[PDB]
Design a protein around this ligand. Structure first.
Ligand SMILES: NC(=O)c1ccc[n+]([C@@H]2O[C@H](COP(=O)([O-])OP(=O)(O)OC[C@H]3O[C@@H](n4cnc5c(N)ncnc54)[C@H](O)[C@@H]3O)[C@@H](O)[C@H]2O)c1
Lengths: 497, 497, 497, 497
């Protein structure tokens, strides 16, 4: 599969067709491996957002009246098409985001998993029927679609996060307007085209490109019923407040600071492999990336020297090269912020075991590249421990026993993911049932739940009370109706009745 | 059972014991049938709210560690005690609220139904277990309690609405702080005493009396996790906004304007009986009360003359008299507001078929009594159609056919309850699946769902995305955790392993 | 699509490849439209059955260890292949069975529906997890595959009935041996080939052709765990007895005698259309075919004259002709038995309104053709009312009111399907909740439940206690295991633990 | 609580009242601690069985028409009564069965748990409702009662096993006829009296005493729909065959041979305590009793010497003495058979570490008493390993590693219960998912599942395909009905419609 190249402007999607921007405002889109802009993306105004919402509202009733099995068959055709063109989408993601090609393939596969789950929506839409609640009265419940829903997605997963939202929403009978991240929008348009090739009626799925202005226009529109958001914690709080102020259902996912605990009885080699992978995959630009390593007892001297040796030997380069393990950062501002965090960590007393600054890649000297960074003797009061770096920086914190590690983890402001490596059943049971984290792994560095369970963190990692996809996602996109029924005597109509 | 009389001050409940107020501010509590104050209720300050929250937080961990079956057994003993003392509670409710004694007995029975449902919580807390999601990895989910939750309840159901909230919350493993309506608080204290007699540990259930100040103190406290509110629409919106601003889970129920549709093929006598009962039970002080009668075709001339004849013959008096069908209004200000609504309805062109103003009850001349009021030829642009009166006022709106009635109902701002009387299966099916209302009745004037389904309206009748009690109530009070587990080889420990 | 022609012998399927018979015994296979044999089918001995069972048992462990999502993906590829080659399978079914081409297409579509449901097996295999049943003890359940299962299918649905069984059994992790009807076996082999093209491992699905001897060999084999059977009532009882005697799980479906009730307030034209279709589709060779019309009140004179007029105008001929509505009978012996039933009905006093005997089709004079037959004034004591004819014969029974019809239906020995045509809600509710029939239709002549509900009749129509496909089908193919877990203190291993 | 004494004849229960026997045949009932008969029990003939079945069939329709919530309230009152009189029932059980008083109290508590689960039947009877399966068609399922069901129970649990059956059957809407064990029938009558005091209508619950003749009369009766049986394997197979031959739903539970595995990393003291308790509680007369101890590696020398030391120090005497840990055997024939098994074990080469024969209890010299017996070096080919002794006999089998123990357990003919003691997570996971046993314990000697999961073994331990109580028990007592509904246009009735 050849590398993705294109210079045309990136527009919006409306009525089952691409449309060029009309506001006159554009933003450059960079190739991170080259360090220069390659195309532009239009920034939609209020009128284009209103046009997309009107199209979705016009399309909603007929799509809602469609039986769920036919909607599932449309999603089945879309799944076939997605399996057909996975390499092209992965190449687009590598070109714009900058991750490794195999990582993009894995992201596409993870989105296809959610689509596979959504294909079975007739089973998921079962209501409850109760007969003879009193003498001659029956009572049953069902769930019905809301209307027009909106989704706002980040840059690090331009394909998987939209697949967390739109398949289930379309399966339950809603219409969707998507606002992708402006740093890598092309994938969204690609997906929309595939949705049109699968037989989806026009207006059911629309795309608008833009920034904070388009988000505010979406949040203020009275014809929008629900909002799903994925991003950082402050923006999630702002989105939740503004959407609740206008009377909408909101779910918003925030940031993370994920810990991995190594017990004295853990497998050392597997723990080192897990730490390396989960800390330096995709250059640490994942919500489930491990950023703090908690070392218990005397295993620290068996972990830090090994991990450092693996950190210096990472292969860094262009994402389309097969042997490359880590790609560049998305933008230069993010790279500068990561370097500032490293400088702050050095200034506040943490030991800099491995320094990744000042990296030059041959043939990619202008790319936004950096090396892996490893700290030691990190303290809870340091800024590199409390704040989210979102880069290839790993810190090590040493504790005396299991209870100290549990208390340290429970005191953090984030509750997204946690992992523990051990061979003892009782320790695993107590850690699983005592930790204040939404997603827990036992010898699993990145515990992303399956498509039929749902994704969601605790504390400041989630604003709302429902999770993404799964049965939680099904319930978020529908509203419950109850019906109580009885009849009187029919002898009036005739003796036969 | 004798009438309830008492002159002691009404205080708060803390640590399994009543406590007198310490702020120094009190509010009078009236007997509506007599028209004069009979006791006082203390208004808690910020310090007393903080004390209650601290007690609940101290009690939370041990109660959460208790197995669900033992919590269910505590609730079972509480159910036995509630069945033992139902008449005393009903007499208290009649004395303070002013409803008929049989109506109070029905309210207590409806609360006991929710307690009966909550007794079966071990079945409801089943998680999902999946084996071999990949080779050697298992994945399971569970739901865990939130912590300290708060409930805010209105005056019209001083017993049933608190039973919508605290039984399920206690069954799932939370601690509860209740803020009852200050117009009739005594019942809450009674319930708390019963909860202590059933073996509930101290601090798990606390009561604070007060007003907007106590509500703000509860909404601002950082140790409170969830808020449940029942009341009018503006206060519900205010509560939701203020609680979301501090990062809490919120559910808030608002007002209503319930319609009943009479089709040309309906049973006339049963329709008249249903209209009379559902419009003039409890003096129209119910969220599920019918306030608009929609008459289709030529049945209007068969409905209005009959209903009016029943409206003039209502027996009105003190709630403890067995023959009385309707009691007084809760306060004199509410009576004045209802009379103002009647005057407005006369001024705007509606025909006043039956006028209930200027009623004097022999022996209860100082009571807040009023008669039944019936309007005719009500239009959608009138204020008596758009706004909630919350009194014994019924208006009649005439339409030409089924579609006009459906369009009229779907254009209202409220979506709480709706009813339709017919003998045709297709009309019932289309009405049930097309109406934009949360709770639907077919020949059922007041379609309150069963304890295992849940209570909730649509549009401006509910702020949030979860319903009260049932599985929705169970999910509102818990948070989901996912666990993924795997193990490595054990050959290192020995050849036997 | 051309008509299907082939003269090769029909063999068995083993280890992912066709195999020729080795017993030396064959049976002729007829083309019903031509009236002559066109090919042969081998009849397997005991050794070939044992070979198939051994292959399935050898393949079972690896297939059971496969994660459910990969099995679902194999079924997804099989679904794609089935959608690709539906017309060829329909042509084969028309050539051997003799039904109309559109009817065969509908049968293939109905099987594809069950495959679509089975593709979502990871959701269906969720167990129950409960935490802290007592202090420190957890309890969870799961369902695991049985092993080798066997299926026995009739002639009238050579594709749909096997799809009732093998997709769910393969999804839950079992291996399958199929014994198709010897009258039309080719479709089974076709399906097996498709299953091999989708990536199914060898030995997971095997086919053996034969007769009572092969069935007895399957029922006596100690390595077979479960048996599913579809056929007539006496054979179902025999199969259940013989399989239970050897300690196996059994489900067996029997015969039917389906009634349709016409109320005085029903739509006459729609009732006539439903009666014609459900009585003369596929020449009455369906378990859900309507064979008795129950007429209530004075509607009989509006039903019998119309239906008869439609019965004389049926177009009968070769199944590949587009304008043909009814095809021939499967064999000449069945045609002779149907004619004997008609003669018996004439002899016992029923009025022969329309006689279908003595039919000659131009160009198909040797085919097993017969016309539609209509009786009137049928009594419960007649043999044409009590016994199943399984042909294009419809009888009419007149009753006075609703209760008489209900009592008549509840006294029959069969309980498979029932239908009622009315416009009254109360009558529909009472009929649905009072009738002693497994499958009920309100204005639906053939109420076959959806893929996510399950298929099953009552009384003599089913031997066992579980239904086919759906959650019932999932539970039939799995066994439940419970696990209770606890751990002791880990302080012995170290102070850190 | 005083010891239970009574000399009146034990009769049957009919129409909510005790009735004396009329056949003229009686059987003596022994006090095992005294060794002499104390009363008689009548053995019902065919006519009395027919009378009980007729009474149940007469009572069935009204009980089935009762709403489930009222049936649940009847069960709630019964639960209150059972909690009130638990000590009297325990004393009766101790007097007739001969177990320790605390053991009888535990049995009563375990039955009360099942009653508590059954009190929540309205939630469990939820059907599935699906809207718009096609355009204008809805489909929903429900479950309805079967009719008259019969239960047959053993001697070792005269209270708990009947509570496995009749509460769920009554909750789902059936009528029950009970055939208790003739060795200790009084408890059944006691329970029936309590059921009458709770408001149960007459004829819903009937009791018949007897033996094989009464069982055959029950199995042959055409008005009985379902049979539940608990007992030994040969009788279970006979009952299943005879009940299937007459077309009934059957579930039958058989015998057991439960193994406990001790790993080298297990806690030695806790393992010894578990072995002693689970092997010598209730004199080994439990289906979940541990009869084989599997010792892996070098732990055998740390287990056998300790266990033997505990086996010689057991306190044996009358069950009403507080300090007694083990009571006598139920009959003298059972004691003789146990002694014969011990003699056979000595003859076939097993080492008799501890011999319990020749025991004399001071003051109870005529009682059917025996001591604890411990064998060592037991082989799979011995009769004491393959056959069920059902007494206080424990054998020890030594294996080399984990795989040998798993292979040994999987080769047995019984699959009821299994336990494994270890501190390693991976070993526990592999043992739980690989063992061919229905009920599994990790560090739990007796893994009886909770009331909301269900009880059932595998292989020769269960005949049928459904388990006892839980959702399996709910599904066994009900049959599923499907309803598909649609309506035509209503414009014919009028323009308004
Ligand atoms: N949707 C439902 O299920 C439901 C049920 C019952 C009643 N209601 C509604 O309740 C209303 C009648 O009850 P009410 O008159 O007691 O309602 P309300 O709005 O006064 O709510 C009562 C509660 O809110 C508190 N409250 C009142 N004003 C407040 C303020 N400004 N700030 C903060 N807290 C404040 C009170 O102290 C009390 O605890 C009607 O509108 C009726 O429709 C709704």
């Amino acid at each position: 599969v050849p590398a993705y190249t294109s210079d045309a402007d990136v527009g919006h999607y409306l009525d089952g067709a691409p449309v060029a921007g009309r506001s006159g405002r554009f933003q450059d889109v960079f190739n991170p491996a080259l360090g220069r802009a390659v195309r532009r993306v239009a920034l939609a105004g209020n009128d284009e957002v209103e046009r997309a919402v009107a199209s979705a509202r016009a399309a909603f009733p007929a799509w809602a009246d469609t039986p769920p099995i036919r909607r599932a068959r449309v999603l089945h055709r879309f799944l076939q098409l997605m399996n057909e063109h996975r390499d092209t989408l992965a190449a687009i993601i590598t070109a714009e985001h900058g991750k490794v090609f195999s990582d993009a393939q894995g992201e596409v596969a993870r989105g296809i998993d959610i689509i596979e789950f959504a294909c079975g929506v007739p089973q998921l839409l079962k209501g409850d029927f109760t007969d003879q609640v009193s003498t001659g009265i029956d009572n049953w419940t069902m769930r019905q679609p809301l209307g027009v829903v909106a989704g706002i997605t980040p840059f690090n997963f331009p394909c998987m996060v939209p697949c967390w939202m739109f398949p289930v929403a379309l399966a339950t009978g809603n219409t969707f307007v998507l606002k992708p991240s402006e740093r890598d929008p092309s994938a969204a348009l690609f997906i929309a085209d595939l949705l049109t090739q699968a037989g989806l009626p026009a207006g059911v799925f629309n795309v608008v490109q833009g920034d904070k202005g388009a988000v505010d226009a979406l949040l203020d529109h009275p014809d929008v019923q629900a909002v799903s958001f994925v991003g950082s914690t402050p923006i999630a709080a702002y989105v939740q407040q503004r959407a609740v102020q206008s009377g909408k259902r909101v779910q918003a996912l925030g940031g993370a600071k994920n810990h991995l605990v190594v017990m004295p009885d853990a497998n050392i080699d597997q723990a080192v492999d897990a730490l390396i992978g989960a800390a330096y995959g995709s250059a640490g630009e994942r919500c489930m990336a491990i950023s703090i390593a908690v070392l218990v007892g005397d295993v620290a001297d068996k972990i830090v020297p090994a991990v450092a040796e693996r950190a210096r030997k990472l292969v860094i380069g262009d994402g389309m090269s097969p042997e490359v393990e880590m790609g560049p950062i998305v933008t230069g501002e993010a790279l500068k912020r990561i370097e500032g965090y490293i400088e702050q960590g050095v200034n506040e007393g943490a030991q800099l075991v491995v320094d990744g600054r000042g990296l030059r890649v041959p043939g990619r000297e202008a790319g936004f590249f950096t090396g892996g960074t490893l700290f030691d003797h990190v303290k809870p009061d340091m800024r590199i421990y409390k704040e989210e770096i979102f880069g290839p920086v790993l810190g090590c914190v040493r504790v005396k026993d299991f209870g100290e590690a549990v208390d340290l983890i429970n005191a953090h402001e984030f509750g997204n993911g946690v992992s523990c490596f051990t061979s003892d059943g009782g320790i695993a049971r107590e850690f699983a049932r005592r930790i204040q984290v939404g997603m827990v792994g036992i010898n699993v560095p990145i515990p992303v739940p399956m498509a039929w369970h749902g994704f969601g963190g605790w504390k400041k990692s989630l604003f709302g009370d429902m999770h993404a996809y799964g049965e939680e996602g099904v319930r978020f996109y529908t509203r419950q109706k109850s019906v109580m029924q009885r009849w009187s005597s029919s002898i009036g109509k005739g003796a036969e009745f």
